[PDB]
Amino acid sequence: VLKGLDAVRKRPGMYIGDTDDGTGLHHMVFEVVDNAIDEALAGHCKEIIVTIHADNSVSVQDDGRGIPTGIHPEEGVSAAEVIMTVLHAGGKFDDNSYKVSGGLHGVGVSVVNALSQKLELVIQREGKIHRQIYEHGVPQAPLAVTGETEKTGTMVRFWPSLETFTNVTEFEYEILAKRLRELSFLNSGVSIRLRDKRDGKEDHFHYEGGIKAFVEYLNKNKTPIHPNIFYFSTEKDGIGVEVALQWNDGFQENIYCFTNNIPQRDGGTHLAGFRAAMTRTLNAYMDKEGYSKAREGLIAVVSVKVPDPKFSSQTKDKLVSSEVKSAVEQQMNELLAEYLLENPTDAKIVVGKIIDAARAREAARRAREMT
Amino acid sequence: GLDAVRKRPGMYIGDTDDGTGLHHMVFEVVDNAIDEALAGHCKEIIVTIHADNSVSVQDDGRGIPTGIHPEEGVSAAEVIMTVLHAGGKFDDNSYKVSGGLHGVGVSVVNALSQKLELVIQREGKIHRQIYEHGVPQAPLAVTGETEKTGTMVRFWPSLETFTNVTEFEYEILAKRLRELSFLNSGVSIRLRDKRDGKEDHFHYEGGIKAFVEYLNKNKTPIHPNIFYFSTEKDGIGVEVALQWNDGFQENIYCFTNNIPQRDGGTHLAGFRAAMTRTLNAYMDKEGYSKKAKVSATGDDAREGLIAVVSVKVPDPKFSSQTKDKLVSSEVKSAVEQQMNELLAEYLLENPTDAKIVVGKIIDAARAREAARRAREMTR
Numbered sequence: 001v002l003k004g005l006d007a008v009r010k011r012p013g014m015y016i017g018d019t020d021d022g023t024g025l026h027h028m029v030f031e032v033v034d035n036a037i038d039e040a041l042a043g044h045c046k047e048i049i050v051t052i053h054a055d056n057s058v059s060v061q062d063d064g065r066g067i068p069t070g071i072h073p074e075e076g077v078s079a080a081e082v083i084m085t086v087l088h089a090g091g092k093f094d095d096n097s098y099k100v101s102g103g104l105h106g107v108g109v110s111v112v113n114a115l116s117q118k119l120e121l122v123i124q125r126e127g128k129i130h131r132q133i134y135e136h137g138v139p140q141a142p143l144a145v146t147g148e149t150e151k152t153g154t155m156v157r158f159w160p161s162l163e164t165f166t167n168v169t170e171f172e173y174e175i176l177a178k179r180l181r182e183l184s185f186l187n188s189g190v191s192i193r194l195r196d197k198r199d200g201k202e203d204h205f206h207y208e209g210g211i212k213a214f215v216e217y218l219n220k221n222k223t224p225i226h227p228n229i230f231y232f233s234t235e236k237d238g239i240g241v242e243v244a245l246q247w248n249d250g251f252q253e254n255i256y257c258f259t260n261n262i263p264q265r266d267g268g269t270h271l272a273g274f275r276a277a278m279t280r281t282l283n284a285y286m287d288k289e290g291y292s293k294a295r296e297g298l299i300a301v302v303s304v305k306v307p308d309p310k311f312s313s314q315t316k317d318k319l320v321s322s323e324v325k326s327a328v329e330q331q332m333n334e335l336l337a338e339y340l341l342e343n344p345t346d347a348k349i350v351v352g353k354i355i356d357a358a359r360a361r362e363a364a365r366r367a368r369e370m371t
Numbered sequence: 372g373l374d375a376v377r378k379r380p381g382m383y384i385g386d387t388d389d390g391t392g393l394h395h396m397v398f399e400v401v402d403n404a405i406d407e408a409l410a411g412h413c414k415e416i417i418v419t420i421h422a423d424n425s426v427s428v429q430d431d432g433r434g435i436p437t438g439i440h441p442e443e444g445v446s447a448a449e450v451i452m453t454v455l456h457a458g459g460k461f462d463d464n465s466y467k468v469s470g471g472l473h474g475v476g477v478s479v480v481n482a483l484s485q486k487l488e489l490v491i492q493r494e495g496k497i498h499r500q501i502y503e504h505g506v507p508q509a510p511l512a513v514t515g516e517t518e519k520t521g522t523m524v525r526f527w528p529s530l531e532t533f534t535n536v537t538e539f540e541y542e543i544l545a546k547r548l549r550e551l552s553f554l555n556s557g558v559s560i561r562l563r564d565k566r567d568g569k570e571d572h573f574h575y576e577g578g579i580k581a582f583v584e585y586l587n588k589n590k591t592p593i594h595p596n597i598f599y600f601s602t603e604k605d606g607i608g609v610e611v612a613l614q615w616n617d618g619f620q621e622n623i624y625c626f627t628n629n630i631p632q633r634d635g636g637t638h639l640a641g642f643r644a645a646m647t648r649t650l651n652a653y654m655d656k657e658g659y660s661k662k663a664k665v666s667a668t669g670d671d672a673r674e675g676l677i678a679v680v681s682v683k684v685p686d687p688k689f690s691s692q693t694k695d696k697l698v699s700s701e702v703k704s705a706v707e708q709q710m711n712e713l714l715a716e717y718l719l720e721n722p723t724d725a726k727i728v729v730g731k732i733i734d735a736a737r738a739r740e741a742a743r744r745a746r747e748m749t750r
């Protein structure tokens with residue numbers, strides 16, 4: 001009634017992005033994948049399997065607790081159905097402070113359901129298999145028990161509506177793979193598989209130290225100047241901070257900022273805390289070691305898990321959560337100081353690069369005034 | 372229904388004329404609170420004896436569900452309080468030992484209480500309900516707001532039910548409340564008396580070890596290191612602590628989901644089998660004679676032994692409705708295997724203790740044999 005999918009069908013782009021260039025189409029997958037993975041931080045979901053089917057449908061299978069199946073006393077339909085049909089039911093029902101669900105972005109499976117011509121939901125929970133079918137968001141029958149199972153978890157298979165999605169209606173394996181890998185880099189210990197039924201292509205993304213692995217991927221076609229990547233994965237006051245960095249022989253700076261898996265193009269408090277810690281730590285090391293009074297060649301990832309994050313806008317390109325500056329700055333001041341002393345072979349190379357770049361920047365400015 | 376319980380009360384709580392049933396009323400409520408603790412929801416239980424001979428039990432659990440049961444039209448809490456086996460039906464926790472007569476929970480306590488007050492703190496609000504001989508005076512209703520979660524059950528035992536012994540004995544409550552804290556390490560159990568201001572606080576991080584230290588407090592241990600462990604493998608939690616004293620009595624206290632087994636069972640059997648194999652393998656290794664090894668196997672009567680064997684088993688099976696003998700065949704294997712492994716590490720880790728214990732066991736067998744031969748040779 002009041003809370004429904006009519007809003008979504010009328011203005012799809014507002015919720016998932018542009019429906020005519022393939023961005024919205026691929027985001028449909030990542031809205032399902034975000035609902036799967038958000039259950040990972042508390043240890044419920046351990047493995048997500050994403051499959052591109054021959055019929056241009058995508059299924060997402062997890063091994064979580066399974067979406068609740070109990071009849072909502074007010075709505076009179078299964079808790080999973082309430083979530084699928086009531087636009088914001090999911091985000092409201094979920095207690096998880098780390099899930100970033102808003103009015104338009106990150107709404108979840110209900111958005112996917114609205115723009116899907118058909119949706120199949122399969123829930124393994126309490127030793128029973130529950131199945132449901134949806135057509136343009138309308139259930140065909142109530143969620144029903146079809147069998148028995150030893151496993152728990154949810155499976156959502158969706159067929160994008162062709163009345164919504166134009167021009168690009170086929171999933172690009174590479175778009176899915178790049179984001180699924182990143183998600184596994186940012187959520188260590190989580191297993192994410194990508195399968196393609198059109199050609200048999202598949203990948204498996206699983207890292208025990210995803211933050212380190214992320215910087216090794218960013219530097220694979222580069223020339224790292226020091227052998228040891230500086231990384232850490234800490235949790236303090238409900239704020240998880242992961243950082244990995246390594247200098248290359250290059251002259252560009254590339255810091256990749258993330259807050260609850262969401263990229264921050266324009267940075268924020270996590271970047272600022274990272275920068276302040278690096279300047280204080282490198283200045284402290286150069287002071288103490290005798291080197292007299294944006295960083296060329298830096299490749300870094302700053303990934304935070306913060307409950308209820310705050311952003312500068314609807315785009316979520318700048319993190320504004322003040323407590324995240326301190327949370328990042330504190331840990332990186334402590335642990336990068338330890339890294340420089342524990343790896344003086346690496347620390348010599350890094351400082352050597354910073355000084356040579358300062359010698360070149362100053363001499364290049366002086367060469368301008370010369371002629 | 373609760374008319375059956377009111378018609379034959381002692382069948383459910385025990386006899387209503389000697390204070391056994393009366394005190395069991397407390398412990399049934401306390402057990403419904405404790406079952407939330409293994410899950411990790413309930414951290415503290417406060418038991419209070421009120422000056423009006425009512426007992427209140429308060430926990431910091433999740434609070435009994437308040438939502439309307441779509442089939443019953445009344446709150447899930449009310450369905451649990453009024454319908455006998457509703458509590459054990461709704462609760463998916465297999466470790467909860469809900470019997471047909473004994474251990475049905477608060478519903479039995481309610482049916483036999485002339486007044487019962489239930490206060491649930493859940494989902495940011497306080498809900499209250501008043502019961503009279505089992506019948507609710509109004510449906511569960513929100514009275515106020517709260518930041519805390521938990522359940523409070525205050526009950527006034529019926530004087531038409533409980534005769535001769537209608538006053539709560541602090542010692543009966545304290546003794547069992549302490550035992551329950553030994554068997555559920557990490558759980559805080561406070562006991563208060565409003566009649567004299569008397570209070571106790573039972574909390575142990577190593578309850579199984581502490582239990583044996585309490586049992587050996589007015590005795591003389593012959594070895595300083597208590598053998599103890601607390602493990603879980605394939606849903607069976609096994610806690611064993613043991614220590615020998617200079618005495619000639621054997622006392623092995625067996626427990627299954629807090630319920631004591633007077634006549635032992637598969638946990639006692641798994642304990643005895645582990646002990647025999649481990650003492651026989653140690654004696655084989657240490658170079659003991661065939662006579663000294665026979666002297667320490669033949670009969671399982673360990674003079675000077677004090678042991679506690681407590682098990683957490685989902686859905687245990689007993690020889691009868693008394694629960695005096697565990698019959699769950701899979702518990703022997705769980706006890707036996709974990710004790711064979713860890714008792715063998717103990718004997719190696721503490722070889723002073725190992726030599727004292729074996730020494731004692733053979734010595735008592737040599738003395739009993741010596742007494743038996745002295746009996747034979749007497750003119």
Ligand SMILES: [Cl-]
Nearest residue numbers: 193203204205
């Ligand atoms: Cl593999």
Ligand SMILES: [Cl-]
Nearest residue numbers: 561571572573
């Ligand atoms: Cl205290």
Ligand SMILES: [K+]
Nearest residue numbers: 091092093094
């Ligand atoms: K919420």
Ligand SMILES: [K+]
Nearest residue numbers: 229230231232
């Ligand atoms: K490291």
Ligand SMILES: [K+]
Nearest residue numbers: 100260261262
């Ligand atoms: K997210």
Ligand code: NA
Nearest residue numbers: 263315316317
């Ligand atoms: Na963003």
